[PDB]
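Case study: MoCVNH3 variant.
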Amino acid sequence: GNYAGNFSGSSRDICLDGARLRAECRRGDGGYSTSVIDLNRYLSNDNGHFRWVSTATVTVQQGDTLRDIGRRFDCDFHEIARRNNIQNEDLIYPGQVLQVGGNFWDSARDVRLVDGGKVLEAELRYSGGWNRSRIYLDEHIGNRNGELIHC
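Here is what the predicted structure looks like once written out:
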């Protein structure tokens, strides 16, 4: 059924400032708050495609390759390599900690909101170029009593 987020149903004057989403969010008392949420914590570039993966740290398991990590957490192994200062074809080791998710902003351009601030659109870098991608923010951005949250 319904999206879990649905911020736009109770927000207005939705705008972008870099990767930070700003809005006037309806409160329970009937007034408004000016609120902000950093989309760079919740959205990632998966080889040319927006994905909902929040900034997180993971621990490499026995038998894991970098692609195995990417598959498990729905991230691009090229991104995991770049973000963790290693290389694409590099071996990884059990017990190793790796940063994953978020950080779409690093590899994006022409970033903007469309359809009244409900859709985020950008060109995202992939292995051999740029791909236009879009994502419905109401999927995971909500308004809790005047405050923009991820849910």
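For the exam, be able to explain this: The radius of gyration is 17 Å.
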